[PDB]
Structure formats: structure tokens, C-alpha cells
């Protein structure tokens, strides 16, 4: 009886194994854009992907993950709110049932059609496995879907899913490069919080971008398809994998932009 995203080991059960899911800097959360305050001390953010190495794509029963070699320092993100530089490991999404749900972060109560999270870590502390007892452990760049005209950029991921359907399976998913996932502008939001799923670690600086990307219908459909049972198991559709807005308690979410 492991966590999930369904009625009997959904989020509002994770608190039993994951005590931590109550606590004071959780996440994802509501960005209320007329109290956030722009801090101009905040630097533009530095995405530097031009020798990110994509290893594999993987089907964990919760998400697809697109894993990077992270032995070097190639794709890394430093500036914005951060101090040193967070080295790329991983990229995710969350998505919903229907068009109307799915992003984990919204904006003014607004749910995105979906949420792309970039998972880095920080190089102070040498492994993702030691970055995430960390307060300043990871930094995750999030980024909104909405569905309109298709993002060329996926198409790559899109058209890899049907070799990963259910949970366990991966394939190789080499010479991917995530800058074709970004939008124009890089401004954002910021704030202290925590991974999204058990285990709900409070290690995460949030950097989530106000401009949204646009996908495709067909392609949103293609990640619906996906199976969170394992091969040879009841089908359940992988859909609706977001955590719901937890409390902001006692945090202050920056806004880079006037
Ligand atoms: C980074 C992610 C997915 C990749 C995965 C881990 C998490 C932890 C939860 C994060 O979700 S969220 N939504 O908070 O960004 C995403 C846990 C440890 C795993 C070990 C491994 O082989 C892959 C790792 C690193
Ligand atoms: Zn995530």
C-alpha cells in the first residue's frame, strides 16, 4: 500500500508515512501575483544547457523522468535567487485528466494544463542523495503547459512514451536538449519549499517562470496514455499526478519582474 495519486494513497494520505507533508515550507502553493513582491536585488536566472547529456527516459509508476549525466559540470543553472550552481539531474511533469487540470503550482487560483519541473542539485554538496538533507539542497525550475499550438521541442519525449507505458520500464534517450523546452522570457517567481512527492523533503529553492509553453493536444493525449500499474496489471491511466496548493504559512513568494 505505497503512495500515490488515487483515493486510498492520494496526498491527502502521504502525511501518515511522510510526517513532514503538515510542515512549514511545502510545496507547490498558490502564487497570489498581487502579493508577491518584486525584489530588484534578484539576478536574471542562467540556464546553461548547450552540453546537457540526456542518458534515459524512464517510467518510475508516478511520472516519466528524463535523466541526465550530472558526473560533470554541463548543465547547470546558477543566478536568480540561488548561490553557486545546481547541476541538472532530471526533468519531469505533472498533468490532469482534462485540459482544466494538472500543473501543481497555480497562479491567482489559475491551473495549467500541466507543469514541467528541471530537478537540480547543488554542487556544494557533492550528490543529489546529500543535497536533499539540505535546505539550499536542490533548485527546480517549473514551468507551465497550456494547450495550443504544439511545442516541437517534446515531440522527441512524446514520441518515446509508448516504449515506457507501464512502471519500471526506461529506454535509452540520448542527445535530448531540454533548451527546447523553455519559453522566451525567464522571469519568475520565487520561494523556499519542498519536492512535491514523498519524500516531501523541505530542500528546494522554487523557480517557477511566469510565461507559460504552449503543447499540443495530441501531445498532452500521448502522456495520458501512459500507465501508472506496472505491465500485466489492472490498467489505471497515469493522469492527475499533481500534489494540490499546501499552505504558504510563514514565506514570502519574490516575484524577478515588474
Ligand atoms: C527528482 C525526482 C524524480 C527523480 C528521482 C527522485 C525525485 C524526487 C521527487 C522529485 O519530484 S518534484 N515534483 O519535487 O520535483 C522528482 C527521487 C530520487 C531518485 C533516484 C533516482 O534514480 C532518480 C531520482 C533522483
Ligand atoms: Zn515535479
Known amino acids: 500500500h505505497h503512495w500515490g495519486y488515487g483515493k486510498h494513497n492520494g496526498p491527502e494520505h502521504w502525511h501518515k508515512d511522510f510526517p513532514i507533508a503538515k510542515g512549514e515550507r511545502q510545496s507547490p502553493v498558490d502564487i497570489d501575483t498581487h502579493t508577491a513582491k518584486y525584489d530588484p536585488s534578484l539576478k536574471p536566472l542562467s540556464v546553461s544547457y548547450d552540453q546537457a547529456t540526456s542518458l534515459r527516459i524512464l517510467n518510475n509508476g508516478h511520472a516519466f523522468n528524463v535523466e541526465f549525466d550530472d558526473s560533470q559540470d554541463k548543465a547547470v543553472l546558477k543566478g536568480g535567487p540561488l548561490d553557486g550552481t545546481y547541476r541538472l539531474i532530471q526533468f519531469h511533469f505533472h498533468w490532469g485528466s482534462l485540459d482544466g487540470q494538472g500543473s501543481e503550482h497555480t497562479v491567482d487560483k489559475k491551473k495549467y494544463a500541466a ?144
Not at 516504449?163 to 522570457?185: H, Q, V
Request: with cysteine.
Open 115 to 258: 507543469e514541467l519541473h528541471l530537478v537540480h542539485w547543488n554542487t556544494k554538496y557533492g550528490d543529489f542523495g546529500k543535497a536533499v538533507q539540505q535546505p539550499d539542497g536542490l533548485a527546480v525550475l517549473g514551468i507551465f503547459l497550456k494547450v495550443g499550438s504544439a511545442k516541437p521541442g517534446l515531440q522527441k519525449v512524446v514520441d518515446v512514451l509508448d516504449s515506457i507505458k507501464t512502471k519500471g520500464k526506461s529506454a535509452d534517450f540520448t542527445n535530448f536538449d531540454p533548451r527546447g523546452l523553455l519559453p522566451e522570457s525567464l522571469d519568475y517567481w520565487t520561494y523556499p519549499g519542498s519536492l512535491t512527492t514523498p519524500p516531501l523533503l523541505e530542500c528546494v529553492t522554487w523557480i517557477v517562470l511566469k510565461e507559460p509553453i504552449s503543447v499540443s493536444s495530441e501531445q498532452v493525449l500521448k502522456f495520458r496514455k501512459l500507465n501508472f500499474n506496472g505491465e500485466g496489471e489492472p490498467e489505471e491511466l497515469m493522469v492527475d499526478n499533481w500534489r494540490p496548493a499546501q499552505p504558504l504559512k510563514n514565506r514570502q513568494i519574490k516575484a524577478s519582474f515588474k
